[PDB]
Ligand binder design. Structure first.
Ligand SMILES: */C=C/C1=C(C)C(=O)N/C1=C\C1=NC(=C\c2[nH]c(/C=C3\NC(=O)C(C=C)=C3C)c(C)c2CCC(=O)O)/C(CCC(=O)O)=C1C
Ligand SMILES: *C(=C)C1=C(C)C(=O)N/C1=C\C1=NC(=C\c2[nH]c(/C=C3\NC(=O)C(C=C)=C3C)c(C)c2CCC(=O)O)/C(CCC(=O)O)=C1C
Lengths: 608, 606
């Protein structure tokens, strides 16, 4: 928090190995310059300030130019210093950063002796490597041989922005850092952000003399120099403290940017001073690029493969579960392996009112009932809201402290449906996975990096979002269960109704513009009318009584229908053939949650 | 296809610019060799054939070796020819393809003339710019300046393997090819497949003299040379015809391979002869890979963004839809915008037995009923089986020719559920999207490339697999609808039966375990007994009649219950006067026909 609040991009200091000048794109005048400029360029800080760059420039290659909006970056090219008699003992090379209001020229030694063509057999290998692990180690081993670093490691960022050394290539005599876990605070967010912008950075000598930009703020713009893109940018004195405490004298780290996000870093350490020249710096850029590219592709194909297997298994469960009308014991015992696999659970428990069907490695029925009871609690009603489609825990003891135990079999779980009481419910469980976090430290930078193995009990393997959506996708199985149950009970009650002696009908109350329709009619009611049951459903009630029926008796029926009340009247029926069939109409209003009657029960006593 | 039928990988011919030899990994002797070898190597085809390679070429950088299974490929390295009195008018460079039974050495001029270093500002720029379009044009403009080709274009493959020029950089004086559509037959599957294997190919001069491999078939293996990995491999005379008809003299194309699949190509044309040396072929591979990597990342972020918006909206619909027990008109009118957005439809229609709730831009009720009827057809049962979780069409006229019209509003659609009849159903519709496809020809290769704008009607915007999964994920609302309907009807029937004047009870059978128990009982049946409805549920049919009942009348009831048949007997009940009543036991239908429940009714005295 207070660590992440540090400029780091505007230190007003550079590394002493190179020289930096700030040029005004209108005049070509040097507005700001680092103290290291005076010694190489010839002219001291006095006249060097406010001087046209061309008088101290000898660039045989490309030249700087005006930029409209998007800045342009020119590569390291030969630079010579005319206002001095052979100032360097080594070849010098200058890079340009051209922004609309300022130009920045950074120059550093060429160095020579070591390159892109020799990196190609390595790049070509990782491009066709299977799995991130294989590529990561190939890159560390390969890069360690290409540049000459004492140790090269691939630092993968995890979900909480912590880090893990997943690959390492080092001098045999060195203590291995492989598999060591570092907190998220070691690389604060403001640094991580810059590591997407500036993808390769070097520290030639940890604890150097930082060379400051003479006018710290722009003499006419009043702004500090945004050294985000300058490779010479002086690094944090907190990181330089950490690096000295770790015993490293030189650094070179390149970002692994997968899908426009910092996936990890290629961290190189040298326990002696080491300047990585523009050439080696470009080679490490190419390997980081290729490694980020392969990781992404492998991750993309993986997801794509997993999603299609997980779909088949889901679609089989939806079909198999629909096809069977009565949910037998062998049905669920066949379903169980695929019902666990879809979400990658260690066990599953199917609930249907007091009954529980447990499969795989799950707690006992008493505990599965203890877990379900606890979730549907009034106390845990906020959890079900804040949950997305299914409630899930990675560590039962944290979320549900009263279910602290049960962690060995149901440490993690996916509970569906989010609706309380419900009758039908699915509970996927993952058992405890004792995790061993290999800290290189413990919880201003740390002096010691001693191994500290934190043993974490009561947690299960994290539910991947692929497995959480696979769960949400199977909510349809809960509604399948409920529908089929109400369907079974409804047809039973309809069968009992359709075979009654007394002739009954369920009337749906109309509206002002709608009329009262027959919703249900039994064979005894339909036969007294003449028409078959199917033809009479949806027929208006006003149809059933003869278009002759007395005013008084009809108005009594209409008054109850109008007011949603009850009626008992003898009315003649609309005769299909002849004989006047009078029946006594017993209209009774069926209860409504609002008390405002929505349906009636019409029954016509069968004479006996 | 008669196009793809051509085995373009075994032509028995090479491009004349380089030399090819087939070496036996046991002896090191040259078994086969292109006619261009004799002139370069010194020794003519006569003594050259069957000669140890070591005698005819000295390699100071890289040497061949034995391979066990997986072939190895050595890069272009310096090659010198000792059997000739100064044969190099230019520097020569040799590449090796080492297979377990054969070695293949292909050599071509070094050419020289800053390269991989100069490509770096371009590579760093594409990996940082947003959107495939921006990158594609950057690559064409950039690559045109790096390797000086007259025109550079980015050819993106579509769903039906056709191709579209999405980016172009050309000599100003040249007629633009940008936005032109080419058929899938122009690059046969045979070629596309090879373009995954061999990632960069060049034609130095279209209509060259093809130099053949002297023993066309291996002298001891009897097989033709699989030139699939060889850069000198002679190209099809059909493409060379096409290229000459288009007026191009030189070509260089590199594959854009996104997630191990051919996404497109970087096609370069030169209207004068042009040989691209190993170095610029490596530079164009680096840009093709960086562009393929940028395309993939942008596609990955896109999916990631879409999946998270589609999720929120889907869970907004599952909650809102569950919360309401009464499906009001304003209910569905509130749901409608989010119900259309989840699948990115232009309209939606909710069905629930004869009723239809139309929202957005959708056809009329008569048409929505015409469509639904057509899907649940007997002669269209093959579609719903072959469909995954939801049936969907991109162009209604193709799949359903009788539904040829309707396309202006329901050109595309997603229908859920796949089960026929089923009272509840959702139909998402996308309206027609008239496409203007700009052909460079018309339907042996075409002589003319004249513009032909096909005005494509009757199709809608393609249903992304993400929207299709967003649809499958909302199958739960169809089951929500059906559950809530059966629940509403069941409580209604339960309320009704619990009046009726006549005493009613539903008897569950006494299978093996237990006896025949009361499943349901109405208030009229419970009152004649004495006990309340709740206490009487679960009780045996034996417990509610009191020990005063005659043997014969009881045995008549017992006989029907035993056989799963019907009865009608007068039996006394439990006296809380004994109270006799007409026991009318009727067997309720079963799917097996084997009776599982009965309807007991006791006619109320009148
Ligand atoms: C302010 C809190 C910090 C603590 C505590 C600490 O240890 N570091 C803190 C701050 C910063 N770290 C910065 C950069 C940084 N951190 C790492 C971490 C590692 N490097 C390693 O080699 C290993 C293990 C071998 C670890 C865990 C790296 C690699 C970097 C970047 C170094 C580089 O790119 O050169 C940082 C930003 C500094 C800057 O770039 O200006 C801060 C403030
Ligand atoms: C049917 C056969 C064919 C017709 C008709 C036709 O026109 N070509 C046919 C066959 C083959 N084409 C092959 C390769 C190929 N085709 C293209 C297409 C284009 N290139 C362009 O520049 C444009 C428009 C500007 C189109 C359209 C391309 C780029 C290639 C690959 C060229 C290369 O990689 O060098 C082949 C395979 C030939 C081979 O490589 O052996 C056949 C057969």
């Amino acid at each position: 928090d207070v660590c992440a609040r540090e400029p780091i991009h505007i230190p007003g200091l550079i590394q002493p190995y190179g020289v930096l000048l700030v040029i005004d794109p209108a005049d070509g005048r040097i507005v700001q310059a680092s103290t290291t400029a005076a010694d190489l360029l010839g002219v001291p800080m006095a006249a060097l300030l406010g001087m046209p760059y061309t008088q101290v420039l000898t660039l045989p290659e490309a030249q700087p130019f005006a930029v409209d909006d998007q800045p342009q970056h020119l590569m390291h090219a030969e630079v010579r210093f005319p206002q001095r008699a052979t100032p360097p003992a080594s070849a010098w090379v200058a890079a340009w950063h051209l922004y609309p209001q300022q130009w920045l020229v950074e120059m550093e030694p060429r160095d020579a002796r070591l390159t892109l063509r020799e990196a190609m057999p390595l790049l070509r290998s990782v491009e066709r490597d299977p799995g991130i692990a294989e590529a990561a180690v190939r890159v560390a081993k390969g890069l360690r041989s290409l540049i000459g670093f004492d140790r090269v490691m691939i630092y993968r960022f995890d979900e909480e922005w912590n880090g893990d050394i997943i690959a390492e290539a080092r001098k045999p005599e060195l203590e291995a850092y492989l598999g060591l876990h570092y907190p998220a605070s070691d690389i604060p967010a403001q640094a991580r952000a810059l590591y997407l912008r500036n993808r390769v950075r070097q520290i030639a000598d940890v604890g150097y003399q930082p060379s400051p930009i003479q006018p710290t703020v722009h003499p006419q713009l009043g702004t500090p120099v945004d050294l985000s893109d300058v490779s010479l940018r002086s690094v944090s004195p907190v990181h330089l403290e950490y690096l000295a405490n770790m015993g490293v004298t030189a650094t070179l780290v390149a970002s692994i940017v997968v899908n426009d996000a910092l996936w990890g870093l290629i961290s190189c350490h040298h326990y002696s001073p080491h300047f990585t020249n523009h050439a080696m710096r470009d080679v490490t850029d190419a390997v980081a690029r290729t490694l980020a590219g392969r990781i992404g592709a492998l991750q993309a194909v993986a997801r794509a493969r997993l999603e299609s297997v997980l779909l088949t298994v889901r679609e089989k469960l939806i079909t198999d579960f629909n096809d069977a009308e009565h949910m037998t014991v062998e049905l669920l015992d066949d379903m169980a392996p695929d019902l666990m696999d879809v979400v990658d659970a260690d066990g599953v428990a199917i609930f249907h009112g007091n009954d529980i069907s447990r499969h795989g490695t799950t707690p006992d029925v008493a505990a599965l009932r203890r877990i379900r009871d606890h979730i549907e609690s009034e106390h845990h009603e906020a959890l079900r809201e804040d949950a997305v489609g299914a409630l899930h825990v990675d560590a039962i003891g944290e979320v549900f402290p009263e279910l602290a135990d049960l962690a060995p079999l149901a440490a993690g779980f996916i509970f569906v449906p989010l609706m309380p009481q419900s009758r039908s419910a699915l509970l996927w469980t993952r058992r405890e996975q004792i995790q061993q976090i290999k800290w290189a430290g413990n919880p201003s930078p740390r002096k010691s990096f001693d191994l500290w193995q934190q043993t974490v009990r009561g947690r299960a393997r994290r539910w991947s979002p692929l497995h959480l959506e696979s769960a949400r996708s199977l909510r349809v199985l809960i509604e399948l269960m409920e529908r089929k149950r109400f369907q079974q009970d409804f047809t039973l009650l309809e069968a009992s109704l359709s075979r009654l002696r007394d002739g009954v009908a369920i009337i749906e109350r109309g509206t002002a513009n709608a009329a009262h329709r027959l919703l249900f009619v039994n064979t005894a009611f339909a036969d007294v009318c003449g028409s078959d049951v199917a033809e009479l459903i949806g027929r208006e009630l006003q149809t059933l009584y003869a278009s002759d029926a007395p005013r008084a008796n009809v108005e009594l029926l209409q008054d109850a229908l109008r007011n949603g009340r009850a009626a008992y009247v003898t009315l003649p029926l609309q005769v299909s053939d002849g004989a006047p069939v009078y029946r006594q109409f017993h209209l009774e209003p069926l209860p409504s949650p609002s008390g405002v009657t929505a349906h009636w029960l019409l029954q016509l006593r069968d004479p006996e």
